[PDB]
Amino acid sequence: STQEILRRRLGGNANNRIFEHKNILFIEDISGNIPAGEAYIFPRGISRMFEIYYA
Amino acid sequence: AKAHVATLEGNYSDIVLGRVVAFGDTGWNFKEVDMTFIADADSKTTLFAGVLVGEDGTPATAAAGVFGVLVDRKVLPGVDHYIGVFEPGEKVPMVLAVRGLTLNQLKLKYADGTAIDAAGIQALEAQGNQVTDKIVGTQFIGSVL
Amino acid sequence: AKAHVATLEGNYSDIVLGRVVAFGDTGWNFKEVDMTFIADDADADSKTTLFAGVLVGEDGTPATAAAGVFGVLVDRKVLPGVDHYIGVFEPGEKVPMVLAVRGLTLNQLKLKYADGTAIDAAGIQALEAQGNQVTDKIVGTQFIGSVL
Numbered sequence: 001s002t003q004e005i006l007r008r009r010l011g012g013n014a015n016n017r018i019f020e021h022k023n024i025l026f027i028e029d030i031s032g033n034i035p036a037g038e039a040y041i042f043p044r045g046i047s048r049m050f051e052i053y054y055a
Numbered sequence: 056a057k058a059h060v061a062t063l064e065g066n067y068s069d070i071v072l073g074r075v076v077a078f079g080d081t082g083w084n085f086k087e088v089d090m091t092f093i094a095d096a097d098s099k100t101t102l103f104a105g106v107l108v109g110e111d112g113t114p115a116t117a118a119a120g121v122f123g124v125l126v127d128r129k130v131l132p133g134v135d136h137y138i139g140v141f142e143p144g145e146k147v148p149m150v151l152a153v154r155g156l157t158l159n160q161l162k163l164k165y166a167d168g169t170a171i172d173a174a175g176i177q178a179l180e181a182q183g184n185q186v187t188d189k190i191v192g193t194q195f196i197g198s199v200l
Numbered sequence: 201a202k203a204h205v206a207t208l209e210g211n212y213s214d215i216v217l218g219r220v221v222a223f224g225d226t227g228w229n230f231k232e233v234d235m236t237f238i239a240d241d242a243d244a245d246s247k248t249t250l251f252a253g254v255l256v257g258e259d260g261t262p263a264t265a266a267a268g269v270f271g272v273l274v275d276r277k278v279l280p281g282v283d284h285y286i287g288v289f290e291p292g293e294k295v296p297m298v299l300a301v302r303g304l305t306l307n308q309l310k311l312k313y314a315d316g317t318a319i320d321a322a323g324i325q326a327l328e329a330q331g332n333q334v335t336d337k338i339v340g341t342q343f344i345g346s347v348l
Contacts, residue, residue, distance in 0.1 A: 032199055073225025157225045177258075183302060183331050185228050 063133040070105055070126060072187070073157035086123060086153050088112045092137070095144040099137075104130045105162045107175065108151060114166030118175035123151035124158060157185040210280045215253055215272070217335075218305030229304060231271065233260035235297045237289045245287025252278045253310045255323060256299065262314035266322035270330075271299035272311060301330055308336040 003010070003020075010017040019026045034040070042049075077083045090112045092100050107115035108125050115121045127150040129137070141147065152158070158179075163171045163186075171179075180186050194200065222228040233256065237248055250273065255263045258270040275297045277285055289295060300306075306327070311319045311334075319327075324334050342348045 030199065073222065073228065075220070075222035075228065076224065155222070155228075157228060181330075185225070185231075185302070 065132040067104070067126070067128070067131045070124075070159055070162050071152060071156055072159055073185075075155035077155065084152060084155050086151050087148055088151060089146045090125075090149040091144065092141050092147040093143045093145060097139045099135060100130075102130055102149075103164075104132070105164055107163065107165055107171065107179075112146075112149070115175075116166045118172055118178055121171075121175045121178050123153045124163065124179075125149060126152045154183045157187060159190055160186055160188050161190060208281045212252075212274075212276075212279055215307050215310050216274060216300060216304055217307055218333075220303035222303075229300055229302045230274075231299050231301050232296050233258065233271075233299055234294045235260045235273075237277075237285070237293060237295050238291045240292035242291045244291070246291070247286060248278075250278050251312070252280070253307075253312050255311060255313060255319065255327075260294075260297070263323075264314050266320065266326045269323045269326045271301040272304075272306060272327070274298060274300045301332070303331065305333045305335065307338065308334045309338060 005019075010019045015030055017026075017028045074084065088108070088111070090102065090108075092102065094100065102114075102125065104126060106125050107121045108123055109115050109120045110122045113120070128134070129147075129149070160171065160176070163175075165171065165175075176186050219229060235250065235256070237250065238246060239249065250262075252273060252275070254273045255269045256271060256273055257263050257268040261268070262273075263269045276282065277295075277297070308319065308324070311323075311327075313319065313323070328334055
C-alpha cells in the first residue's frame with residue numbers, strides 16, 4: 001500500500017501521525033485539550049462555520 | 056556521592072503584587088517592629104518571608120493576632136548571611152507591610168505554616184489592604200500545553 | 201391614545217464622584233461578589249430589581265441595616281442607560297458583580313437600602329470606617345421654568 005502502516009510510522013517522524021483511510025483523514029491531538037476517550041468529526045469548507053470577534 | 060547542589064525560586068515582588076505609591080511619606084505603608092530573630096545554638100531562623108505577625112512582634116498563630124505581614128529584605132529567598140551573626144534570644148528590627156497593599160494569599164502563612172483562613176483574611180483586609188487569589192502560576196517542563 | 205416615551209438621566213460618575221488611583225494596582229478599590237440577578241420567585245425571564253447604589257454585605261446579599269453594609273454595588277450591568285439582560289439569567293442564578301469598597305468619594309444621596317429607603321447614619325458610619333468618603337455637597341441642576 002502507499003503508506004506501509006505496519007512497517008513505517010504514520011506521518012513519518014512528525015508528532016501528529018497524519019493518517020488517511022476510506023476518504024477520512026485522522027489527526028492525533030498532542031495538546032491534551034481533547035478528553036481521553038473522545039474524538040470529533042466535522043466537515044470542511046462550510047462558510048461562516050467559525051468566527052472570532054474582538055472588542 | 057551526593058553532589059552539592061543549590062536552587063533558588065520565588066522573589067520579593069512575588070508576595071506584594073501591587074502597591075499604592077502615596078505622595079509625601081513613601082513609608083506610609085509600612086511599620087517597623089522589633090522581632091526575636093534567633094530562637095532561644097546557631098542556625099537559620101524560622102521567620103520565612105510572608106509569616107503573619109502581630110503588633111508586638113510575635114508570630115501570628117491565629118487570625119485574631121494578625122496585624123501585618125513580614126516582608127523585610129533580610130529573609131527574602133536566596134539571601135542568607137546571618138549564620139551566627141546574631142545571638143539566641145537577641146531582638147532585631149524588622150519591616151512589615153500594613154496599609155494600602157495587594158497581597159498574594161497563596162504565600163501567606165500563619166506562624167507555624169498553616170494557610171490563612173477566612174477570619175485572618177477579613178481581619179487583614181479591614182486595614183486597607185486587598186487580598187486576592189487571582190494568580191496565574193507557572194509551568195516549566197512537561198505538562199504539555 | 202398614549203405615546204411611547206423613554207427617558208435617561210444619570211451616569212456612572214454620578215455615584216462614584218472620585219477615586220484614588222494606585223500606581224501599581226488599578227483594581228485596588230474594587231472587589232467582586234456574587235448576587236442573585238433574578239429573584240427565585242420572579243416569573244420566567246422577568247426583569248431584575250437590582251440597581252446601582254444598593255448597599256450589600258460581603259456575602260453579596262443586599263443589606264437591610266448598618267450591620268449588613270460592606271460595600272456599594274457599582275456593576276456595569278445596572279447602570280441607568282443599559283438594558284441587555286432580560287431573560288439572559290434563569291431565576292435563582294447568580295453572576296459575579298463588582299463592588300467598590302476602598303478609596304472612593306461616594307455620593308450620599310444615591311445610595312439606597314434593599315427596600316429603597318435612604319441611607320441612615322449608622323450605615324454611613326459603617327461605610328466610612330472602611331476608608332470611604334460620604335459627601336452630600338452636590339450642586340444639583342435646574343432645567344427650565346425657573347429663572348435660576
